[PDB]
Design a protein around this ligand. Structure first.
Ligand SMILES: *[C@@H]1O[C@H](CO)[C@@H](O[C@@H]2O[C@H](CO)[C@@H](O)[C@H](O)[C@H]2NC(C)=O)[C@H](O)[C@H]1NC(C)=O
Ligand SMILES: *[C@@H]1O[C@H](CO)[C@@H](O)[C@H](O)[C@H]1NC(C)=O
Ligand SMILES: *[C@@H]1O[C@H](CO)[C@@H](O)[C@H](O)[C@H]1NC(C)=O
Lengths: 50, 50, 49
């Protein structure tokens, strides 16, 4: 921290960006793309690969 | 008396600072809700624990 | 939850239209040193050249 110089933290804390990452990982395995294009759905993963 | 050379740097510099918040907001914020993985994690063989 | 023999097929559809805004051009401008830095000044014009 020198003179006249300062640094501000990111908008989303790493403890929080992990929240978005957790939701996207949790939504992709339990609802494929259905949550992106409308409400999430219960399509089980083993058949979602099919 | 040197003019507005001082402010232009400050206002322009802040633009990048606000820009970073807009960059992260449009990357991770892709879902309007929050999703949690089911307690039991039987995915027909696949291990997501990593 | 999950199930090996489960499925999900939509039985209805909804047509949606979304607006995407993209700028294609910006106000074109031209500037002149001979009039900007020096204003109708012979000595200033000579120094500039
Ligand atoms: C995690 O993924 C790996 C994928 O093979 C598996 O974990 C292995 O489980 C066996 C059985 O005890 C161990 O010998 C291995 O050391 C584990 N890891 C690896 C890399 O082989 C399993 O399918 C998944 N579940 C768990 C709980 O590990
Ligand atoms: C899916 O898992 C169930 C366990 O409840 C099992 O009975 C079934 O045979 C599995 N499906 C396939 C195709 O193996
Ligand atoms: C699909 O949804 C629309 C929404 O108004 C409804 O009018 C229509 O009857 C629905 N179709 C079927 C087959 O239920």
């Amino acid at each position: 921290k020198f003179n006249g110089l300062t640094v501000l933290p990111p908008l989303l804390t790493d403890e929080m960006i992990a929240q978005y990452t957790s939701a996207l990982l949790a939504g992709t395995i339990t609802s494929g793309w259905t949550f992106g294009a409308g409400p999430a759905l219960q399509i089980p993963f083993p058949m979602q690969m099919a | 008396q040197y003019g507005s050379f001082c402010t232009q740097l400050n206002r322009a510099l802040t633009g990048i600072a606000v820009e970073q918040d807009k960059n992260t907001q449009e990357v991770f914020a892709q879902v309007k809700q929050i999703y949690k993985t089911p307690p039991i994690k039987d995915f027909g063989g696949f291990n997501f624990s990593q | 939850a999950y199930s090996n023999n489960s499925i999900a097929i939509p039985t209805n559809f909804t047509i949606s239209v979304t607006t995407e805004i993209l700028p294609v051009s910006m106000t074109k401008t031209s500037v002149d040193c001979t009039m900007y830095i020096c204003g109708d000044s012979t000595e200033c014009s000579n120094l500039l050249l």
